[PDB]
Amino acid sequence: NATEIRASVGKMIDGIGRFYIQMCTELKLSDYDGRLIQNSLTIERMVLSAFDEGPIYRRVDGKWRRELILYDKEEIRRIWRQANNGDDATAGLTHMMIWHSNLNDATYQRTRALVRTGMDPRMCSLMQGSTLPRRSGAAGAAVKGVGTMVMELIRMIKRGINDRNFWRGENGRRTRIAYERMCNILKGKFQTAAQRTMVDQVRESRNPGNAEFEDLIFLARSALILRGSVAHKSCLPACVYGSAVASGHDFEREGYSLVGIDPFRLLQNSQVVSLIRPNENPAHKSQLVWMACHSAAFEDLRVSSFIRGTKVVPRGKLSTRGVQIASNENMETMESSTLELRSRYWAIRTRSGGNTSSGQISIQPTFSVQRNLPFDRPTIMAASDMRTEIIRLMESARPEDVSFQGRGVFELSDEKATSPIVPSFDMSGSYFF
Amino acid sequence: NATEIRASVGKMIDGIGRFYIQMCTELKLSDYDGRLIQNSLTIERMVLSAFDTGGPIYRRVDGKWRRELILYDKEEIRRIWRQANNGDDATAGLTHMMIWHSNLNDATYQRTRALVRTGMDPRMCSLMQGSTLPRRSGAAGAAVKGVGTMVMELIRMIKRGINDRNGRRTRIAYERMCNILKGKFQTAAQRTMVDQVRESRNPGNAEFEDLIFLARSALILRGSVAHKSCLPACVYGSAVASGHDFEREGYSLVGIDPFRLLQNSQVVSLIRPNENPAHKSQLVWMACHSAAFEDLRVSSFIRGTKVVPRGKLSTRGVQIASNENMETMESSTLELRSRYWAIRTRSGGNSSGQISIQPTFSVQRNLPFDRPTIMAASDMRTEIIRLMESARPEDVSFQGRGVFELSDEKATSPIVPSFDMSNEGSYFF
Amino acid sequence: RQNATEIRASVGKMIDGIGRFYIQMCTELKLSDYDGRLIQNSLTIERMVLSAFDEPKKTGGPIYRRVDGKWRRELILYDKEEIRRIWRQANNGDDATAGLTHMMIWHSNLNDATYQRTRALVRTGMDPRMCSLMQGSTLPRRSGAAGAAVKGVGTMVMELIRMIKRGINRRTRIAYERMCNILKGKFQTAAQRTMVDQVRESRNPGNAEFEDLIFLARSALILRGSVAHKSCLPACVYGSAVASGHDFEREGYSLVGIDPFRLLQNSQVVSLIRPNENPAHKSQLVWMACHSAAFEDLRVSSFIRGTKVVPRGKLSTRGVQIASNENMETMESSTLELRSRYWAIRTRSGGNTSSGQISIQPTFSVQRNLPFDRPTIMAASDMRTEIIRLMESARPEDVSFQGRGVFELSDEKATSPIVPSFDMSNEGSYFF
């Protein structure tokens, strides 16, 4: 059932919420202090570093503080398992990993590795979850955009060109094992017969090279117009849960959804502090923090703005660089503001990237009138092959073609999903870059 | 011959309109009931079969519709048609009435089972313009039938005739019957392969496979299918009864004549409970202008109102069968008018004079030229495919032509529409 | 700096000498301010001086005054030596070859706009459906280097064909060279240009060049050349402006800027109109000719113009010039509308086709379109097939001159470009 399913998510929300509550008691931080989104990063970093094989800020009258006191590896994850109740809560750690990657995608433009790995930099809507580490699981890849996979498989080809017996040996056999698991990730995101089918051909030749590289980036050029099933979730910093679970609100009793009204209701009534350097607009940082908690980097700035109560401008025209402070000059100049986490209306997040029967594939001109006489060129002509068939799909697909046809916005107060608010916007800069 | 053709049609129309006014006396129908499409269909249905009869004639009994069957002589009906048609047999008239029903049927029903049950793709309805038509349709009747419809009659020519075969008659038949399709096509290769399909002693899957192939090329490298605006006889009856000489004034099925007629027409149609009259008008209007498998856009543009696809359109049919109760029955006047008008077309797809544009201003815009026409300077299947993979849906055809105004009786000021729009859909199904 | 003042001030003096001469002609002929503004008069004055410099000794034409209701028809006769004298006088004893050339293109453009060259093209063995390329086809050899830049690629191919047809059947061989030289710089594709070198090689021109050049003409339709577009107004408009108090040389002037549009706005030209003809339909003919727009997207013209610039076919007029056959009795006149809404830089070009997300990855399930840079995204041996290659990977829906557009007439110094749109019901693109 759905209520049977949503209860599992609520238990994850409580575990992350209780951890912060035990952390604040342990870090000896005031609740106005411990409301800092700047001091919820490292309290999640460390709690997550307690698996892998930082300044806990304390501003006191006038300026900030960089007291980066360290803690024990074991006792961290001890209090964690002593907070999350029972087992080693795995989902909550992936959830904190996915939230961290959201912030990374919005703020920092991962155009770094695009030009590095030999991929046309204009593929940055696709490169979602490039940040996310290997150590993550199914969710770690489920959110990772088509650009990440194309890249994570591109490296291996050049790695195989370099070769330290890369394909050879019980080491090199264990290599191609992952490289086949990888393609089966990618193939799972593409939502066309031709795309998946092609991905198949890449893994099948477990002796890769230029030809497979050339396909991998071609497939990336395919993903801009025929977008893939890239997951999207609303993972917020644990503090917001740390106040939510402190508000006498059970999350298992109410239920929780990663794509529903719940993270909006949590974000809305939140009082989370933050910091920005001089000559950086206090609420220009708010949009970065807001977009991330909704994983809305690669999102069209139309609906990104329609959902919130204001505009959501690109990074190019923004007064903010980074979310974690830089010991490059002066610290003392820091301004403690409460960012705007609330919005006018909410919208349900989806998985597939929106796609385009015994009807007519064509037309017959009755009237002598000057126009283009349409016909479904894909279907008609469909009778490398996959290379050609794909090139015929993108040309056919128009930028003006509407997706999600029917599904609309939702009034914040509407607890259960019932209010078709499909609005108008066609008034002539959709992108965030 | 310019006003000779205009007299021939006009006469034929004077003929049909006289028979409807006449049948209305023999059926003794009040003016308002004579304007009921249902009655018109029946009066049409009889005149057709008597030349090859009962039927339902409905009446508004002081507010309430009342169905009634009415039978008559197949010989009596003949003289009455001829009396209205002077005396000489008006083959053309009854042929014209055929196209009307075939068009009403192309607008209403999407014969997929009839396509599937003849080894043809259901998605070929575009090409399947008017297969309902009886074999006894005249010259212009053949041009009314679409290229796919011609394939279906070529396929069953093998399905039955070849499967178990005096074939000499149905040997000269298949040949000229294929030429109907061969002359519908518009390219050398399609027309070459056409002759290749007909010149075979024993055709089977060796020809059949090409039929369905040709049936696929005509969804892009389209054939030229004629388009005759043919209206409910009650329209004509009305206009003859109103003192119109069509032989004098002139008439043109492709022209402005039916358009301005429908403009001044008043045909009442019965509606079901619920069943939207606004949408019902769309059914008849499309059938009147043989404009069903036509870009809903150029249809809605001419109409000046949004013409809606099937299923999104809300009417079960056009004729009311016995299964329908008379109690819960209503009726309104159909909205048969449109904003503009355009000349109908026999043509299917795209010299002397401009083809390209040589810019003069440094303004950001798209330089418009024509790819097809500009590019015009043993195996057809190779070339047909080669041609098709060199033709996109953005190709401009009928370049220069536009939809005229009703006041533009002598069509001089064309308005060629613009779709800098997204997608409003183009397919009626 | 040095040419920023020099070129501006010089063209000014070129239009000043036109305006000075036409004024000192309306004197010698004795023409009223209103009778001086009749384009038919202007057109006579113009072709006289054009004949005068060329090479019995007298030459003239039709001259028109508004006498007592109807228009009259005097027919002037001036010594060609006196015309050369008066034109020189107004140009301050100076050569004035540009002046003449300027007045020479105006005529070519009135021609490129009125008449459709078909009789000519077919008889050259060329395709009639090539109007767009036939620019400046009226302009003579006597036309200077500038008068060559205005000439369309088709005009050149046509000019080359004759000398490679009639001429091939000494000193006139560098002619076939200079022509080929000229027609080579037009093409903005290395492929089409290289075959022009193969034409600058034809030691004995026959069919090897004929059908080859005719192919190079066809290739212009899709892969178009670099053809100049200048604004050349009737002398009367230049004369009026001078008499009005303008000092163009020190006021500056460009054939390609706002200045001609600025004159036209304040201009009040008059034309004779035959019984059948529509005044605003005539007014169009001159306007297009004035801006060399006879081969523009009628849409784009109608945009800048602010009036349905109708195709040639739907235009009820038989050209500016009134011939000897028609009688002045059945003849009225009206002031032409030669105005426009916005204005636009003219171009020698024939059109042409790196940062940030080209597309978008959805996050919320709210109805919208998934917008993407289709034009970028989709753009992922023998010199003759090299052209046909490009003539296939081309799309009519591709935008050219990206980032450009019209301006308000107040915008003397182009500051803010306005890009047009045509989401409204128009009338098509091709004038012919």
Query: Which letter does DSSP use for residue B135 in this model?
Result: T
Q: Which residues of C touch B412 (CB under 8 A)?
A: 314
Strands C66-67 and C70-71 come out as antiparallel
Q: How was this structure determined?
A: X-ray
Give residues with Cβ within 8 angstroms of C245, minimum separation 6: none
- Closest to A45 in 3D by CA, of A1, A104, A86, A88: A104
Residue C110 is inside which H or E element, if any? helix C97-114
Identify the chains in contact with B, defined as 3+ C-beta pairs within 8 A: A, C
**Token representation of residue A177:** 């094992």
Rounded CA-CA distance A117/A150 in Å is: 10
Which residues are C66's β-sheet partners? Answer: C71
Number of Cβ within 10 Å of residue A385's Cβ equals 10
CA distances from A369 to A344, B298, B412, C218, C324 (A): 46, 7, 14, 26, 42
Say whether B416 and C426 touch across the interface (CB within 8 A).
Answer: yes
> Which pairs count as long-range contacts for B108-114, CB under 8 Å and 24+ apart, including other chains?
B108/B283, B108/B287, B108/B317, B108/B318, B110/A358, B110/B310, B110/B429, B112/A358, B114/B152
- Closest to A127 in 3D by CA, of A152, A155, A96: A152
Residues of B with CB under 8 A from a CB of C: 351-371, 373-375, 377, 390, 394, 396, 399-400, 402, 412-418, 420-422
The per-residue b/e assignment along A45-65, b for 16 or more CB within 10 angstroms, e otherwise, is ebbbebeeeebbbbbeeeebe
Which among A358, A375, A400 has the least Cβ separation from residue B422? A400
| CB A335 within 8 Å of CB A319 | no
Rounded CA-CA distance B129/B150 in Å is: 9
Say whether B395 and A373 touch across the interface (CB within 8 A).
Answer: yes
At B268, give phi and psi (nearest 5°): -85, 140
**Token representation of residue A55:** 């300044």
**Side-chain half-sphere of A198: how many Cα atoms within 13 Å?**
27
Residue C265 is inside which H or E element, if any? helix C259-266
Rounded CA-CA distance B64/B58 in Å is: 10
| CB A270 within 8 Å of CB A40 | no
> Which pairs count as long-range contacts for B68-75, CB under 8 Å and 24+ apart, including other chains?
B70/B27, B70/B42, B72/B26, B72/B46, B74/B49, B74/B50, B75/B50
Rounded CA-CA distance C96/C411 in Å is: 32
- Residue of chain B whose alpha carbon sits nearest to that of C221: B356
* Residue pointed to by tokens 């580490």: A133
Instruction: Give the burial class of A316: count Cβ atoms within 10 A of its Cβ; 0-12 exposed, 13-18 middle, 19 or more buried.
Output: exposed
Q: Which residues of B touch A371 (CB under 8 A)?
A: 295, 297-298, 396-398, 417, 419
- Closest to C408 in 3D by CA, of C337, C266, C316, C304: C304
Q: What length does chain C have?
A: 432
The per-residue b/e assignment along A247-274, b for 16 or more CB within 10 angstroms, e otherwise, is eeeebeeebbbbbbbbbbbbbeebebbb
| CB B37 within 8 Å of CB B268 | yes
Say whether A403 and C368 touch across the interface (CB within 8 A).
Answer: yes
Number of Cβ within 10 Å of residue B92's Cβ equals 19
Identify the chains in contact with C, defined as 3+ C-beta pairs within 8 A: A, B
CA angle B402, B403, B406 (to 5 degrees): 145
Give residues with Cβ within 8 angstroms of C138, minimum separation 6: C107, C108, C111, C112
Say whether A369 and B403 touch across the interface (CB within 8 A).
Answer: yes
Give residues with Cβ within 8 angstroms of C413, minimum separation 6: none
At A335, give phi and psi (nearest 5°): -115, 115
| CB C70 within 8 Å of CB C258 | no
* Residue pointed to by tokens 């349709």: B137
Rounded CA-CA distance B298/A366 in Å is: 9
Instruction: Give the burial class of A103: count Cβ atoms within 10 A of its Cβ; 0-12 exposed, 13-18 middle, 19 or more buried.
Output: buried
| CB C205 within 8 Å of CB C168 | yes
Residue C44 is inside which H or E element, if any? helix C39-52
At B386, give phi and psi (nearest 5°): -60, -40
C30 torsion bin: left (phi>0), alpha (psi -120 to 50), beta (else) = left
Query: Which letter does DSSP use for residue B125 in this model?
Result: G
| CB B95 within 8 Å of CB B140 | yes
**Token representation of residue C274:** 């035959």
Say whether C218 and B374 touch across the interface (CB within 8 A).
Answer: yes
Give residues with Cβ within 8 angstroms of C159, minimum separation 6: C151, C179
Rounded CA-CA distance B188/C105 in Å is: 45
Number of Cβ within 10 Å of residue B12's Cβ equals 24
Task: Measure the CA dihedral B197/B200/B202/B208, to 10°.
Answer: -10
CA A175 distance to own-chain centroid: 27
Which among B216, B344, B402 has the least Cβ separation from residue A366? B344
- For every residue of C383-411, DSSP letters joined together read HHHHHHHHTTS--TT--BSTT--BB-TT-
Rounded CA-CA distance A341/A267 in Å is: 5
Q: Which residues of A touch C371 (CB under 8 A)?
A: 300, 399, 430
Say whether C377 and A394 touch across the interface (CB within 8 A).
Answer: yes
- Say how many Å lie between the first and final Cα of chain B, rounded: 40
Q: Which residues of C touch A422 (CB under 8 A)?
A: 366-367
At B353, give phi and psi (nearest 5°): 115, 165
**Helical packing angle, B380-388 and B205-217, nearest 10°:** 20
- Number of DSSP helices (H) and strands (E) in chain C, helices first: 18, 7
Say whether B397 and A370 touch across the interface (CB within 8 A).
Answer: yes
| CB C303 within 8 Å of CB C420 | yes
Which among C356, C365, C368 has the least Cβ separation from residue A300? C368
Which among C118, C135, C399 has the least Cβ separation from residue B358? C135
- Closest to B214 in 3D by CA, of B310, B121, B299: B121
Instruction: Give the burial class of C416: count Cβ atoms within 10 A of its Cβ; 0-12 exposed, 13-18 middle, 19 or more buried.
Output: exposed
CA distance C214 to chain A (A): 29
CA distance B382 to chain C (A): 19
**In A163-192, alpha helices (H):** 169-189
Instruction: Give the burial class of B133: count Cβ atoms within 10 A of its Cβ; 0-12 exposed, 13-18 middle, 19 or more buried.
Output: buried
Number of Cβ within 10 Å of residue B125's Cβ equals 27
| CB C156 within 8 Å of CB C183 | yes
Resolution in A: 3.0
Residues of C with CB under 8 A from a CB of A: 354-374, 376-378, 380, 428
Residues of A with CB under 8 A from a CB of B: 357-375, 377, 379-381, 383, 395-396, 398, 400-402
CA distances from C248 to A232, C21, C257, C276 (A): 66, 14, 14, 39
**Helical packing angle, B91-108 and B277-288, nearest 10°:** 140
**Token representation of residue C428:** 């098509």
HEC letters along C337-377: CCCCCCECCECCCCCCCCCCCCCCCCCECCCEECCCCHHHH
* DSSP reduced 3-state for B403: strand
User: Looking at chain B, after which residues does the C atom sit over 2.5 Å from the next written N, breaking the chain?
Assistant: 52, 165, 350, 377
* DSSP reduced 3-state for A195: helix
Rounded CA-CA distance B380/B384 in Å is: 6
Rounded CA-CA distance B218/B223 in Å is: 6
| CB B100 within 8 Å of CB B107 | no
Rounded CA-CA distance B232/A178 in Å is: 71
Say whether C361 and A221 touch across the interface (CB within 8 A).
Answer: no
- Closest to C316 in 3D by CA, of C346, C273, C357: C273
* Residue pointed to by tokens 């006088």: C89
Rounded CA-CA distance A414/A421 in Å is: 12
Q: Which of B112, B313, B395, B427 should one mutate to test binding to chain A, selecting the residue with the greatest count of A CBs within 10 A? A: B427
CA distances from B228 to B142, B345, B408, C104, C214 (A): 12, 8, 21, 53, 42
Say whether C118 and B352 touch across the interface (CB within 8 A).
Answer: yes
The per-residue b/e assignment along A162-189, b for 16 or more CB within 10 angstroms, e otherwise, is eeeebbeeeeeeebbeebeebbebbbeb
Q: Number of residue pairs across B and C with CB atoms under 8 Å?
A: 175
